Amino acid sequence: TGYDLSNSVFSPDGRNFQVEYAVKAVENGTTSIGIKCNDGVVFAVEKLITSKLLVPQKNVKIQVVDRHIGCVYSGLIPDGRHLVNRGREEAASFKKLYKTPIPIPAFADRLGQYVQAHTLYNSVRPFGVSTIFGGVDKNGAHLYMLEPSGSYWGYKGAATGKGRQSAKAELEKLVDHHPEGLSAREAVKQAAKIIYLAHEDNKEKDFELEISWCSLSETNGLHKFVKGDLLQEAIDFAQKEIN
Amino acid sequence: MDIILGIRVQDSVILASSKAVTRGISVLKDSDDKTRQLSPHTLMSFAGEAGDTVQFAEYIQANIQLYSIREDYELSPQAVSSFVRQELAKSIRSRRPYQVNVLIGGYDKKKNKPELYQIDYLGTKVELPYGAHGYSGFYTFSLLDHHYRPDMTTEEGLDLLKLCVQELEKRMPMDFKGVIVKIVDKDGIRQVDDF
């Protein structure tokens, strides 16, 4: 054996064990989710409060790309930041040449190819993050989830991290109960509930909720963080459902 | 710089080179030796652009000396002249070419023959019985066409050379402050101190 010691090496199965090992790092991370809605997307993440000394609201994890795309990830946080930095470069060069802001499927393949490139050589390490991202473009709303292998698909709802299975089960209920569609303001409230429900798989430390959203009607197609009254309203909705 | 002459006779090559170094309206020096010994039996005189002349001469000198140490052997005058020509032939298509004209006087010990090569800054090589660079040639070539014989002695060559310097001192516009004369033969290179 030794097939798992080097990246880009095929095992006799036809697998790249190094990528599968990166997936383990992702499974270790905190829970993050994405919910596609009527005219946009909603992102939410679990922030473990390690200590009282952490300044609340001041370790932001959701990142914006361009002015219309939002990204959130689970696993190695620095690896996620590297991927967003690339995403921003890719989006800038697309806007530079083609004028229009990068479409979400276009943006999804830019990250996809870049992450896939890090499975081609033994001189680089695969990304230790699964990234949930999306936004609003000329063709409406799109939600994506990208994995260490470079594999990505479009999603109605997405989840990754330590509470992914709890979150996925909750997401599947929304898709079944709302075939016509979920509203942006509803999705924000649901996102809060699902993070609170997915927190059961990480319940030693208590946590801080962070939400963002892009919506054609609510945020005018731009990425914005959910703060203040709308955030506390979403937190209360979630608190009511766990009890 | 300015005046460099060369005469090949029966058994030796004689190089005469002006002693003046002028810059502007001032003769800065009247005892300048415009020559480098490339090897024990090979001498090179040079004239041309300020700085370029000595820089080139010493660069060639270093290379020939390097060859001599590497092979424990002296390159023939023909071989040295070909090396020098090629360096100039490269130079002329550089960003800043060497503006240097040279005469190479040597005694081939294998052939037991004196040899004189005239090479201009373009890399134009010719073997000659007598040679000159710059305006000097316009007087000396015709003079030597008349008085030169191929079987002359070194003493006859020096008298023939005195005739050239006298003509130049009479008809040339500039004061070149006389010449340093050197003889290349089977016993190597030596300088005539009273000319």
Binding site: L5, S123 | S76, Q78, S82, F83, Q86
Partner: protein, 244 residues
């Protein structure tokens, strides 16, 4: 990273030997024997082709003996493909020297440079050395007739008579036995063929398993001629010395 797969071709053993050079020499010891013999009036190059097939085109073939310029030739022992890389370099180097100095390159200078290239592959670059040993046979007006040998280490030495490739130990003993300094070319031709005939791993030495060449001053007055022997000429010289 890629460190895992690096053989480290340019390192020392604990004994102070270069692994790859030693193994390249081991490779060369299985190649067909080549012999050089320097006489007072010329040089002989003789080499044994590696086990021939009857359908091999013998006349339009070159495997052992190559021309570097009009005054210098080489006998090869090892990988032919490796030798041709080095031969083309040597050919170019000779022309560079001629272009620079308007004189044919002295034999040792050419030999030193080719040997310096081999040396480089043993000290830096992480590549395998050339699996080739040369016998250089040439003439210049400084030292006259000269024989050299170089090997994968890049070390070269001069010889009166020398063998490379297979059975060098036995071949060298035989050459050391019958060689003398006042020898002529035609005597050297006979010694070369006799030595191969005794050291050969084949049943009997024939014309189709040999390459032969002489470098004589046997042209007309003070000039050197290279003669790469044709098949029929090797057949005749083999009969003339009574080997077949």
């Amino acid at each position: 990273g890629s460190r895992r797969y690096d053989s480290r071709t340019t390192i020392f053993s604990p004994e102070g030997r270069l692994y790859q050079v030693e193994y390249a020499l081991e490779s060369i010891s299985h190649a067909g024997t080549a012999i050089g013999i320097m006489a007072s009036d010329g040089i002989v190059l003789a080499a044994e082709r590696k086990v021939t097939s009857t359908l091999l085109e013998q006349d339009t073939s070159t495997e052992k003996l190559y021309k570097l310029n009009d005054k210098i030739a080489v006998a090869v022992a090892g990988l032919t493909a490796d030798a041709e890389i080095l031969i083309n370099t040597a050919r170019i180097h000779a022309q560079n020297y001629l272009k620079t100095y308007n004189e044919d390159i002295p034999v040792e200078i050419l030999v030193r440079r080719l040997s310096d290239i081999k040396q480089g592959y043993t000290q830096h670059g992480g590549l395998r050395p050339f699996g080739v040993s040369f016998i250089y046979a040439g003439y210049d007006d400084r030292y006259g007739y000269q024989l050299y040998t170089s090997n994968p280490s890049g070390n070269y030495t001069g010889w009166k008579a020398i063998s490379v490739g297979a059975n060098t130990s036995a071949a060298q003993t035989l050459l050391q036995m019958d060689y003398k300094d006042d020898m002529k070319v035609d005597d050297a031709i006979e010694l070369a063929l006799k030595t191969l005939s005794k050291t050969t791993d084949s049943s009997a030495l024939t014309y189709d398993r040999l390459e032969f060449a002489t470098i004589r001053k046997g042209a007309n007055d003070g000039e050197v001629y290279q003669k790469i022997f044709k098949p029929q000429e090797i057949k005749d010289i083999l009969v003339k010395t009574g080997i077949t």
